[PDB]
């Protein structure tokens, strides 16, 4: 079976209990994770160790908190106490865990299920081939010896409009925001980087990225995490919002792909 779980945010206890509920069996089963494995929750260190041990029984995409973790580790960015990253940053195997973490994809595609995963979704301004090229480009810089320069360059909110003629730092920033930060879109598809409210509370003319028809969503299902204020609600057919705010006192949600059945683990916080 194929299982998809949203933002774990260090909620190791709830992750293991959810996986025991469905009797997840490495080897017979595969786990897809929407990223943001770390921060906010108490057990970011245990979650990384466990997800890394899954090997090819796990298909991960990196979220914005994963990237922030890598920026702190490399001394690019300052640690926020609220993130509870210190046990992970101070662990003896932190190098091993974070070098593995930076080599993970931004995008996962399964042609047989016609299923696509990214942390925040697929911008409607991208077709599949553009999405893949963009993920390859940012993954290539993240798995390189020079990744702290990228992590520094990535921070920013412009440009917010895709073009195949975007070059250099601006192309990198947009790619990073589209995969890990996107929520709302203007009618033309351009990213809005500031609103994190629910769709009904958002100011016009903002609509959610998935309410704007795009080439990927028309041929593929898309699963994503990231957008907690959506609460997993209000998406169209074929769009699966899996982040139900576990770290925030919501729930950890698992979707089994074969039968589209949901399993829910309440937050222990
Ligand atoms: Mn996120
Ligand atoms: Mn998140």
Domain map (residue ranges) of the chain? 2-266
Give me 24's structure tokens: 């997840």
Cα 7 to middle of ligand 2, angstroms: 5
Cα 227 to middle of ligand 2, angstroms: 7
Cα 228 to middle of ligand 2, angstroms: 7
Cα 63 to middle of ligand 2, angstroms: 7
> In 114-155, which ranges are continuous DSSP H helix?
128-142, 147-154
Cα 253 to middle of ligand 1, angstroms: 15
Judge contact between 79 and 86, C-beta under 8 A.
yes
Question: Which residues lie below 8 Å from residue 94, measured CB to CB, with a gap of 6+?
Answer: 73, 88
Cα 165 to middle of ligand 2, angstroms: 30
Q: Can you give the resolution of this entry in Å?
A: 1.9
Distance, CA of 78 to CA of 68 (rounded, Å): 9
Distance, CA of 6 to CA of 232 (rounded, Å): 10
- Which approach determined this entry? X-ray
Distance, CA of 196 to CA of 102 (rounded, Å): 26
**Tell me: domain 2-266, CATH 3.60.21.10, correct?**
yes
Cα 134 to middle of ligand 1, angstroms: 18
DSSP assigned state of 189: S
Cα 230 to middle of ligand 1, angstroms: 12
Instruction: Report strand pairing: 115-118 vs 239-241.
Output: unpaired
How many C-beta atoms lie closer than 10 Å to residue 51's C-beta? 23
Taking a 5 Å cut-off on Cβ, the residues next to ion ligand 1 are 36, 63-64, 226
Question: Which residues lie below 8 Å from residue 260, measured CB to CB, with a gap of 6+?
Answer: none
From 88, 35, 22, 93, select the one nearest 66 (Cα to Cα).
Answer: 35
Side-chain-side CA neighbours of residue 128 (13 Å)? 15
Cα 32 to middle of ligand 1, angstroms: 15
Distance, CA of 90 to CA of 73 (rounded, Å): 10
Cα 44 to middle of ligand 1, angstroms: 15
Is residue 80 helix, strand or coil?
Answer: coil
Beta bridge partners of 2: 30
Residue with tokens 């998406």: 235
């Amino acid at each position: 079976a194929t299982y998809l779980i949203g933002d774990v945010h260090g909620c190791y206890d709830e992750l293991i209990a959810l996986l025991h509920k469905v009797e997840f069996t490495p080897g017979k089963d595969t786990l897809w994770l929407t990223g943001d494995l770390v921060a906010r929750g108490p057990g970011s260190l245990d979650v990384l160790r466990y997800v890394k041990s899954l090997g090819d029984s796990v298909r991960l995409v990196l979220g914005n908190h994963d990237l922030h973790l890598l920026a702190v580790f490399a001394g690019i960015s300052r640690n926020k106490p609220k993130d509870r990253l210190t046990p992970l940053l101070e662990a003896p195997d932190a190098d091993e865990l974070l070098n593995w973490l930076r080599r993970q994809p931004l995008l996962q595609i399964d042609e047989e299920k016609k299923l696509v995963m990214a942390h925040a979704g697929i911008t409607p301004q991208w077709d599949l081939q553009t999405a893949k090229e963009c993920a390859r480009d940012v993954e290539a810089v993240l798995s390189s010896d020079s990744y702290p320069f990228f992590l520094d360059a990535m921070y920013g909110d412009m440009p917010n409009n895709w073009s195949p003629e975007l070059r250099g730092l601006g192309r990198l920033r947009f790619i990073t925001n589209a995969f890990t930060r996107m929520r709302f879109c203007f009618p033309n598809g351009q990213l809005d980087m500031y609103s994190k409210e629910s769709p009904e509370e958002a100011p016009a003319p903002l609509k959610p990225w998935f309410a704007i028809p795009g080439p990927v969503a028309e041929e593929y299902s898309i699963a994503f995490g990231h957008w907690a204020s959506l609460e997993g609600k209000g998406t169209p057919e074929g769009i699966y919002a899996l982040d139900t705010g576990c770290c925030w006192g919501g729930t950890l949600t698992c979707l089994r792909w074969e039968d589209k059945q949901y399993f829910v683990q309440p937050s222990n916080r």
